[PDB]
Amino acid sequence: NELQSAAEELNAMLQYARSEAVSQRRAISIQALKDKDWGKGLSIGVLASGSIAAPLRKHDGFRAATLTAKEKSAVEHLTFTANGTLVPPTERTFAICQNGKTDGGRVLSISQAGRIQLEPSSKAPQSCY
Numbered sequence: 001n002e003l004q005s006a007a008e009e010l011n012a013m014l015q016y017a018r019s020e021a022v023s024q025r026r027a028i029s030i031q032a033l034k035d036k037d038w039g040k041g042l043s044i045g046v047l048a049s050g051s052i053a054a055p056l057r058k059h060d061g062f063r064a065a066t067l068t069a070k071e072k073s074a075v076e077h078l079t080f081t082a083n084g085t086l087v088p089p090t091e092r093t094f095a096i097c098q099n100g101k102t103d104g105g106r107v108l109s110i111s112q113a114g115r116i117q118l119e120p121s122s123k124a125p126q127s128c129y
Contacts, residue, residue, distance in 0.1 A: 006062040007096045007106040010038055010069050011118045013059050014078070017044045018114060020056060021080035027087065028056070031077040038069040038094060047077060069096045069108075070129035078110075085114040095125030102128055 013030060021028035029047035034040040042059040045052040062069075072093040079087050086092070092110040095102070105128065107119040 002062075002064055003067060003096060003098055003104060003106060006039060006064075006067050006069065007108060007118055009059060009062070010094065010096065011108060011116065013042050013044065013057070014108070014110070014116045016057060017078070018080040018084055018116060020044065021082060022084050025082040027079050027081055029077050029079040034061075036070060036074050036076045038071070039067050039096070047079060064098075066099050067096065068100065068128060069094055071095075072127075072129055074129065080114060083114075085112075086110060089114070093125075095128050097125065097128035100128055102126070 017028050017030040030042060030044045031052055032038045039062040041061045043052040043055040045054055045056040081087050089112050091112055094108040095105055097105040102125050105125045107123050107125045109117050
């Protein structure tokens with residue numbers, strides 16, 4: 001249940017950043033505040049000089065410290081554009097893992113078009129990154 005909830009919370013935050021970019025017709029970012037681990041705190045809003053000074057929304061981190069959410073290329077932030085795409089429009093892959101192992105883990109993907117998908121549990125991450 002804990003990992004399901006964590007994956008859903010990360011999904012909701014990513015979706016919110018994208019939807020705000022589309023609705024506001026401008027670049028809205030989401031940033032992992034600690035260790036490039038998207039489960040240890042997030043901010044959403046306009047990114048400038050490496051930070052989001054006036055957040056639209058925050059996430060305090062997953063309750064369990066033993067959960068991690070890391071992206072394949074170790075990104076610390078993502079920026080969605082007015083058309084819903086990422087800049088750069090690079091495919092992203094998040095692995096949500098318990099205890100640093102992939103068993104029971106989940107994959108959250110973002111396509112080149114900016115489409116965010118929490119993949120079914122029948123797709124375990126290839127790595128916790």
